[PDB]
Ligand SMILES: Nc1ncnc2c1ncn2[C@@H]1O[C@H](COP(=O)(O)OP(=O)(O)OP(=O)(O)O)[C@@H](O)[C@H]1O
């Protein structure tokens with residue numbers, strides 16, 4: 001017991017966190033040992049995680065472009081909650097600091113685009129915001145979306161379309177038949193009559209490389 | 214121009230009886246590598262000196278008066294005194310180092326120290342612990358000789374010694390030698406109990422006391438299958454000194470003493486030699502390392518901690 005107690009202080013003054021924990025454990029084991037080293041080892045460890053992680057506990061979430069969140073461990077805002085930086089943990093949206101430039105549904109208008117962590121932010125919200133400013137007066141062929149027949153429709157747990165359960169993700173070959181997503185990731189827009197395209201001049205839209213329009 | 218350095222005729226004293234180093238073995242050491250070190254431990258009359266002599270450079274048919282390691286004499290048994298003192302040293306022609314050891318916790322040393330710490334009783338225990346730790350940190354293998362089965366006090370002493378040793382940890386192999394065995398001890402039924410007790414009494418010893426030196430494969434038991442034993446530990450038995458129908462000898466029930474001695478010697482010599490420190494060592498380097506280890510063990514800190522507790 002005396003040897004274990006004496007060895008514990010040496011390891012307690014030596015400390016992502018996995019490497020530090022392993023090094024501390026090895027140092028403690030090599031420093032001293034006895035017939036009751038399990039209790040001392042457990043005490044030294046558990047006083048690890050408690051004071052470990054929370055400090056250099058990085059957010060591990062990745063954007064849909066494979067970029068890590070730049071924030072420390074943080075909570076997501078609930079529906080209608082504002083971001084609160086001063087809470088522990090902070091309440092923040094994920095952010096990779098990456099930016100791209102994207103064109104609208106019809107291609108005529110470009111805007112800066114933040115790196116999306118959510119599929120609605122990626123396939124819908126960016127384009128909806130641009131559509132109000134560009135293509136919202138053009139003719140559209142709308143894709144079917146989930147229409148709730150109940151005030152609280154459930155996500156489907158993993159033939160007339162379901163009105164009680166929605167597809168949480170995008171429609172693909174492995175999805176159950178008859179589920180629709182809450183929003184379409186696709187858009188189909190009429191730019192004009194066939195004569196609006198001129199074979200000799202190409203498309204009159206911004207962002208095209210010269211001669212590729 | 215390639216003759217050997219020299220041949221040793223008698224063992225020398227590696228450590229004086231006063232726990233003092235004696236640097237006098239370098240004259241018989243070379244610069245060769247891959248050396249093997251064997252040590253012994255036991256009680257007063259177990260017979261460690263005789264075993265070491267018969268295993269290093271002697272034969273049972275020889276006489277006890279010319280053994281490499283001095284053995285107890287008839288005039289000494291009547292007085293109940295010890296013969297071996299300190300630590301001995303001897304190296305055979307195969308470059309195998311053999312180290313002797315004085316009895317641990319023997320009443321002879323205690324009585325001799327009476328007419329010469331708080332009381333003169335913990336000194337013997339600490340000397341025994343010091344010798345055990347030294348043999349456990351600078352020797353390739355340690356052989357424990359027991360006069361009788363299950364002393365119940367040697368296991369605790371071994372664990373305590375290994376717990377207070379000086380210092381990716383190195384643990385030498387441990388061999389359990391049962392000297393002066395009888396016919397009753399050469400039965401499979403008793404063998405199973407012996408192995409079971411040895412395994413259950415040293416479950417958390419951290420030493421290599423199994424998987425090597427299996428007497429079952431040494432043809433000792435012809436028809437005994439290996440699966441008959443749950444866990445065959447490294448345990449060996451050494452028996453006591455050893456018209457045509459009327460000349461038949463008595464029934465002993467155990468193999469001949471010479472056969473078992475030869476088998477034990479062959480098994481000990483054919484053992485592994487793992488590295489001691491984090492570097493390659495030679496004979497001279499090993500000697501210097503052992504000297505440094507002994508010096509450090511003498512002026513250690515764990516020993517003082519254990520001393521204030523008694
Ligand atoms: N297997 C044996 N069969 C018969 N006699 C033995 C056997 N082993 C040892 N003896 C005898 O019993 C005594 C044992 O003392 P020995 O010299 O062998 O060493 P020891 O008991 O280790 O000595 P120490 O007192 O220094 O620890 C000796 O007289 C020896 O001849």
Ligand SMILES: [Mg+2]
Pocket residue numbers: 261262263283284285296297
């Ligand atoms: Mg002796």
